[PDB]
């Protein structure tokens, strides 16, 4: 689990989004596993505006933050699934690291702020859904 809170926005994994997330839908992308919902309480997170390829992510399944090198956001085919069709995901960044399904929503951050959230895992890779291209997350 886990979310980003910037301004009056909540960013979550689309597969983990609640009834309340969908009641207050701002934006979703099924190909990116991202959903943004509206919040009443102002969030204090800063979104990274950069092309860092290094940072730290939280891994709930190890209760540990790991420093990682990661790929630039790309279209990638993700093997295995759940209740979803083991398929393509856009704006996805891979690193070598530990990721289980419940690690989704773990934040990846550089010195500039929030880069993305854990979205995929397996084979000793962790996938992160990039949010840095969503410039509208920092205004009204
Ligand atoms: C996982 N999902 C998908 C829809 C969402 O709940 C809803 C359903 C209808 C109206 C609404 F405002 C929200 C939910 O729980
Ligand atoms: C659509 N979904 C839901 C979670 C993801 O599966 C995983 C599998 C392993 C690690 C991980 F972090 C995520 C997926 O394919
Ligand atoms: Zn950065």
Contacts of 136 (CB under 8 A, 6+ apart): none
Q: Residue 102: what are its φ and ψ, rounded to 5°?
A: -70, -10
Q: How was this structure determined?
A: X-ray
**How far is residue 38's CA from residue 90's CA, in Å, rounded to a whole number?**
23
CA–CA gap between residue 38 and residue 41 (Å, rounded)? 9
Structure tokens at 63: 């209760």
The CA 101 to ligand 2 mean position distance, Å, reads 5
Residue linked to tokens 């960044």: 93
Check residue 137 and report its DSSP letter. Answer: G
The reply to whether 103 belongs to the active site is no
* Domain assignment of residue 34, given as a range: 3-44
d(CA 6, CA 135): 11
* Three-class DSSP category at 88: strand
Nearest CA-CA partner of 132 in 105, 118, 111, 113: 113
How many domains are there within the chain?
Answer: 2
Residue in the block written with tokens 């205004």: 139
Ligand 2 center to 121 CA (angstroms):
6
The widest CA-to-CA distance across the chain, in whole angstroms, is 40
Tell me the two tokens of residue 47: 């979104």
Q: Are 75 and 61 in a shared domain?
A: yes
Do 34 and 88 belong to one domain?
no
Are residues 95 and 136 located together in one domain of the fold? yes
The span from the CA of 64 to the CA of 57, in Å, is: 8
Please check whether residues 84 and 33 belong to one and the same domain: no
Nearest Cα to 35, choosing from 52, 51, 13, 18? 13
């Amino acid at each position: 689990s886990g979310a980003i809170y910037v301004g009056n926005y909540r960013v979550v994994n689309r597969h983990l989004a609640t009834h309340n997330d969908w009641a207050n839908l701002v934006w979703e992308d099924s190909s990116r596993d991202l959903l943004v919902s509206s919040t009443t309480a102002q969030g204090c997170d800063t979104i990274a505006r950069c092309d860092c390829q290094t940072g730290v992510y939280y891994c709930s399944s190890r209760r540990k933050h790991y420093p990682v090198s990661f790929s630039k956001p790309s279209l990638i085919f993700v093997e295995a699934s759940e209740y979803y069709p083991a398929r393509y995901q856009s704006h996805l960044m891979l690193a070598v690291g530990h990721s289980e399904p419940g690690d989704c929503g773990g934040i990846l951050r550089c010195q500039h702020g929030v880069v993305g959230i854990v979205s995929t895992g397996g084979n000793g890779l962790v996938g992160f859904a990039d949010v840095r291209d969503l410039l509208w997350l920092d205004e009204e």
